[PDB]
C-alpha cells in the first residue's frame, strides 16, 4: 500500500479518525461506567483447588435457614408443625 | 451551633469505657521528646476541643442532657482533672501532675486490675486502694505507649513517652469524612508543641477515590513535558501533536475493544496506571520512524516520495513490530495468574500496545508525508544543539565505550553477581505480611498509614491485641461438591452458585465408618483436647450417647441402626439437643444440614487443632499439607467417597500468597521464553543472541535486586512489574543488534562505531523520554503512581546503560564470518 499513502494521505487520515470517534462514542454510551470505590475488589484467587472450596463454603452460609422454604440448607425447621 | 455544656459539671461520673470502636488521634510533641508539662497537655486538649468540638456532630452517644457532649474527651487531661476533682480540664494546678507521676510510679509495678464497676467500691481484691475508679489501669493500658513506666529504667529517672493517644467520644465510621474533608486535610498540625501524626477515623478506604481525582494533575503535566522534548527532536509541532493524539486515540479504541468486543465487564484500579506506562512507550516508535525517514531522504532525495515511503517502511516496520510485539507478549503473559485484577490488566495493556503499534504503522506515515509543507539566536542555539549532539553520539560515545573496554566488563559482572546474590540467597523478597483489610494504599507518610503500620505496635491495647492466640479449626463436609460457576476466566467478582451431590447416609456402614473416622482423628498429633464442646463436634457421637433411654419410637439399639429409626430420630433428637445447652446455632455449627424436604443433604464435622493462627507462609503451608495428606485417606464406602475430599479452614491469606508465588514465576518464564525466541529470530547469529540474553539477565537481576534492597513486598503491583521489566529490557538490545549487523565493514572494532553512532540518538531519546515521563509521579498521594514512577526510572536508566556498555564491549569479540544462523 506504499502508493496508497503516497497520493492519498487525507483519506487514510480521515478513515482512522472516523473509526476512532465511533469507537469512543460507542464506548462512552453502551457500557456501564466503572465505579472506583473499593480499591481491592479483585484480589481474590479463583479456581486454585483451595479457592473453590472457600467460595463453596461461603455460599453454603449465605443460603441459611428460613422460617419456611429457605430454598437453602436449614436445620430442623420444616418439621415444627407439631406445635 | 452545637453549643451546650460539657460532662464535667462537678460530677465524678464518666460516660463509658474507652473501646477500640471509637476514633483515635496520636500526638508527638516536638524534638523536646517529652509530654509531661502543662503546655503540652493543655495544647493537646485545646486542639482537640477546637478541631473536633466545633463542627456540628450529630453522631454521638447522648447519655446526658448535653446534646453536643456525652463523654468529655477521653484524654490524659480529663484523667488528670478527675484527680483533685477540678471540673474544667483547663484548670490544672501543675501539682496534680506530680501527684499522678508519683501514683503511676508507685503503682506501675503491679502491671493489674480489670475494673471496679461499683461506684466508689472495688468488687474483687486489689493490691492497693489508693487508686481511683479505674484511673491508673485505663491511663496505662489505652492512652500512653509502652516506653513509659518500664521496669528497665532505674529509679530517680524520668521517662519521656514521646507518643500519646487521644480518643473521641464519637463512634468511628464513614460519617467522619465531612469532618475530615474540611478541618483536618489542609493544615499541617497544631502549634510547635503538639503535632498530630496518626489518625484512625476509619475512612482510609472509602475516601480513597477522592484523592484519585485530586491527583490527576501529575499525569497531565507529564504529557506536557513529553511534548516539549519531542519538539526538540523533531522540530515540527505537527508530528508531535499528531503522535500524542494517536497515543490517546489508541488508549480510547483499546478501551472500546476491551469492553464490548471481548465482552467481559470489570474495570480494575491499576488499569489507570497503564496510561502512564504507554506514555513512555508509544513515543519511542516515532523516534525510530522519523529519523529513518530523514536518512532515506538524505540518500536519494531526487526520487519520488512513494519510493522513499516504501523504503522507510521496509526499513522500520520489522524493528517496530519486534519491540512492540515483545512488550505486548510480556504483558499478555500475566493471563496465567489466578488473581483477577492482574488477569485483566494484562489483556488491557497488551491490546493497548498492539493497537498503538498498528496506528504508528498506518497513521504516522500519512502525517509525515502530508508534512511536505529576533530569531537569529533562537535558530543558532538549535543549530549548536544539533552539532553538539552529533559530535557526541558520533565520536565521543564510541571513544568512551571502546577505549576502556575492560573496566566495564568487570564492573558490570560484579554488579550482576551482587544482584543475583541479593535476590536469590540472603535478603530474598518477602511475601505480604499485612491483613487483607488494610493494605498500604496511600503514601507512606500520610497520617493514616502511620497509625496503620507503625503506631499499632507501641500501644498496649494493640500489642496484646496482636497477642490473640486463636487456634485454627478444621472442618469436613460431605454434602456439596466443590465447583465454581460464575465467570472464572476474565471474571466478574460477582459469580457464585451452590449445588448438590448424590450420597446416602442411611447406610449403616457409612454410620460406622463416620464413627471410626472420628475416633481415628481424635488420635493424631494435630489435635487439641478441650473436654467442653458437646455438640460443636461430631454429631453422631453425642447422638449415640443421647439415645440410651427407654420406653419412648425407638430406644436401646445397636450402633448400625436400620436407618428408618435413624432418619426420624435425628429430627426427634436435635429438637431436644437444642434444649440442654447451646440454645442458638447459626449456619456455622457442626449440626447436620437439612432441605425443604426434611431429609439430610449436607453433613459437616468440625474439630480444633494445635497449630496457632498466624500470617507466615511456612507454618500454614506445613499445616495444610500434612493435614490434607492425612485427610486424603478415605478408602470408604461407595457413597460419601465421592465429593468426599473436603477440608477448609480460615486460610485465605495463604491462598493469596501461593497464587502470587506461582503466577509471578510462570509469567517470568513465559515472557523470557518469548523474548529469547524473538531475539534469536531477529538476529540470525547465535553469539549475538547469547550476548543479548546475558544483558537481559544482567539488567533483570540488577533492577530486581535494587528494588528488593530499597525494600518492597509483592502485593499485586510487583507481580506485574517483575514481568514487565523483562519485556522492557530487550527494547534496546534488539535495536543495537539489528544495527550492528548489515554494516559495510568486516572487522571487529569497526562496524560497532557504525551501529552505535547510527542508533545511539534514538536509544538515548527513548530512555530520556520514558525517564522524564515516569519522574513526574514521585510527588503524589496514592501509592501506585509512586511505585510505578520509581520502577520506570530505575528500569530505564539501568537497561539503557547495560544494553549500551555491556553489549558493545561484548559484541566486538565476534568473528566476521561468525555463524549467520541456520540456512533458511
Ligand atoms: C477536521 C477534524 C475532524 C480533523 C482534523 C485533523 C486533520 C484532518 C487536519 C489537521 C490539520 C489539517 C491540515 C492543515 C493545513 C493544510 C494546508 C492546506 O493548504 C494550504 O493552506 C495551502 C496554502 C498555500 O500554500 O497557499 C491544505 C489542507 C491541510 C494540509 C490540512 C489537511 C487536514 C489536516 C491534516
Ligand atoms: C500473543 C497474543 C497475540 C495472543 C492473543 C492475545 C489476545 C488476542 C487473546 C489472549 C487471551 C484471550 C482471551 C481469553 C479468554 C477470554 C474470555 C472469553 O469470555 C467469554 O466468552 C465470556 C463472556 C461471553 O459469554 O461472551 C471472551 C474472550 C477472551 C476475553 C479472550 C479474548 C482474546 C484474548 C485476550
Ligand atoms: C490514567 C489516570 C492516571 C489519569 C487519567 C484518568 C483519570 C483523570 C480518570 C479515570 C477515571 C476517572 C473517574 C471515573 C469516575 C469517577 C466517579 C465520579 O463520582 C461522582 O461524580 C460522585 C458520585 C459517585 O460516583 O459516587 C467522580 C469522578 C471520578 C472519580 C473520575 C475521576 C477522574 C478519573 C480518575
Ligand atoms: C528464569 C530467570 C530468567 C530468572 C532467575 C530465576 C532463578 C535463577 C532463581 C531466581 C530466584 C530463585 C529462588 C530464590 C529463593 C529460593 C528459596 C530457596 O530456599 C530457601 O529457603 C533459601 C534461603 C534460606 O536458606 O532460608 C530455594 C531456592 C529458591 C526457590 C530459588 C530458586 C531459583 C530462583 C527461582
Ligand atoms: C528473577 C525474578 C523472577 C525475581 C525473583 C523471584 C521473586 C520475585 C520471588 C518468586 C518466588 C519467590 C519465593 C517463593 C517461595 C519462597 C519460600 C518461602 O519459605 C517460607 O515460607 C520460609 C521457609 C523458612 O523460613 O525456612 C519464603 C519466600 C520464598 C523464598 C519466595 C521469595 C521470593 C521469590 C524468590
Ligand atoms: C547469565 C548469567 C551470568 C546469569 C547468572 C548466573 C548465576 C550467577 C545464577 C544462575 C542460576 C543461579 C542459582 C539459581 C538457584 C539457586 C538456589 C538457591 O537456593 C539454594 O540453593 C538454597 C540454599 C540454602 O539452603 O540456603 C541459592 C542460589 C542459587 C544457587 C542461584 C545462584 C546464582 C545462579 C547460579
Ligand atoms: C554507571 C551507572 C549508570 C550504573 C547504575 C547506577 C544506578 C542507575 C543504580 C544502580 C544501583 C542503584 C543503587 C542500589 C541500592 C541502593 C541502596 C538504597 O538504600 C536504601 O534505600 C536503604 C539501604 C539500607 O539501609 O540497607 C538506596 C538506593 C541505592 C543507592 C541505588 C541508587 C541507584 C543505583 C546506584
Ligand atoms: C538518564 C540519565 C540522565 C542519567 C540519570 C542518572 C541519575 C540522575 C539517576 C539514575 C538512577 C536514579 C535513581 C533511581 C531510583 C531512586 C529511588 C528513589 O526512591 C524514592 O524516592 C522512594 C519512593 C518510595 O518508594 O516511596 C529516589 C530517587 C532515586 C535514588 C533516583 C535518583 C536519580 C538517579 C540516581
Ligand atoms: C473536691 O472534693 C473534695 C473532697 O471530696 C472537696 O473537699 C473539694 O471541695 C472538691 N472540689 C471542689 C472544687 O469543690
Ligand atoms: C503549621 O501552620 C501553623 C498555622 O496553621 C503554624 O502556626 C505552625 O507554626 C506551622 N508549623 C510548621 C512546623 O510549619
Ligand atoms: C487412640 O488413643 C490412644 C492414644 O493414642 C491409643 O493408645 C489408642 O490405641 C487409640 N485408639 C484408636 C481407636 O485409634
Ligand atoms: C418435598 O419436596 C417435593 C419436591 O418435589 C414437593 O413436591 C413436596 O411438596 C415437598 N414436601 C413438603 C412437605 O414440603
Author numbering:
A (entry chain D): 181 to 263
B (entry chain E): 279 to 389, 400 to 661, 687 to 865, 873 to 1144
Give the text the authors published on this PDB structure:
Importantly, upon incubation with 3C protease, hDisp1NNN-3C was quantitatively cleaved into a larger band and two smaller bands, similar to purified hDisp1NNN; this indicates that our hDisp1NNN-3C construct is suitable for generating pure hDisp1 in either cleaved and uncleaved state. We solved the structure of uncleaved hDisp1NNN-3C at overall resolution of 3.61 Å, and the structure of hDisp1NNN-3C-cleaved at 3.68 Å. A comparison between the structures of hDisp1NNN-3C and hDisp1NNN-3C-cleaved reveals conformational shifts of the two ECDs, whereas the TMDs remain largely unchanged. After proteolytic cleavage, the two ECDs turn outwardly, away from each other, by approximately 2–3 Å, leading to a more open conformation of the extracellular surface of hDisp1. Additionally, density peaks for the C-loop in ECD1 were observed in the map of hDisp1NNN-3C-cleaved, enabling us to build 6 residues (residues 279–284) in the C-loop. The resolved C-loop is moved away from ECD2 in hDisp1NNN-3C-cleaved, suggesting that the uncleaved C-loop perhaps restricts the motions of the two ECDs, and that proteolytic cleavage allows them to move away from each other. Four N-linked glycosylation sites were identified in both hDisp1 structures, Asn363 and Asn476 on ECD1, and Asn836 and Asn917 on ECD2, which, in turn, validated sequence assignment. Similar to the sterol-like molecules seen in the reported Ptch1 cryo-EM structures, we observed several sterol-like molecules in the transmembrane domain (TMD) of both our hDisp1 structures; we assigned these molecules to the sterol detergent, cholesteryl hemisuccinate (CHS), which was used for protein purification. In contrast to other RND proteins, such as Ptch123,25,26, in which the ECDs are close together, the two ECDs in hDisp1NNN-3C and hDisp1NNN-3C-cleaved are splayed apart, exhibiting an open conformation, as previously reported for dDisp and hDisp132,33.
